[PDB]
DNA sequence: TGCGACGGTCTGACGCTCTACACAGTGCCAGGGGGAGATAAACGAACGCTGAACGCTCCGG
């Protein structure tokens, strides 16, 4: 029996805390981050062609100080 | 000037989380200027006391 359990492996989050150099949201399962969404996956969603999904991925679900606030309401 | 070569300069070196941590050897005091806190007083205000005074129902001889 090895140690990836799957009680330490799931991780979710819909808004938790938030970096402060920026203010996209940290990483890290203990400090409720989110997943990453690198180079490739911007790569992928170009390549079907969503525009929108790609900008609220990248400026609704992170990264606006104001934008996340009035989705939420 | 053409030649290699000599050299410096410069760049990145797939992706994520589960995990994930903190950081270490040599001086010393006196004189003087400001503002923080405690003090006792002060000019003005309104806060009370004075019951008085106006007016009412009143039980009444």
């Not at 402060?20 to 180079?39: C, D, H, S």
């Amino acid at each position: 029996k090895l140690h990836h359990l799957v009680d330490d492996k799931l991780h979710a989050r819909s808004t938790g805390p938030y970096s402060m150099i920026t203010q996209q949201p940290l990483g890290g399962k203990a400090q409720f981050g989110g997943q990453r969404f690198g180079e490739m996956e911007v790569w992928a969603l170009e390549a079907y062609g969503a525009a929108y999904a790609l900008q609220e991925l990248l400026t609704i679900k992170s990264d606006d100080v104001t934008g996340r606030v009035k989705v939420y309401e």
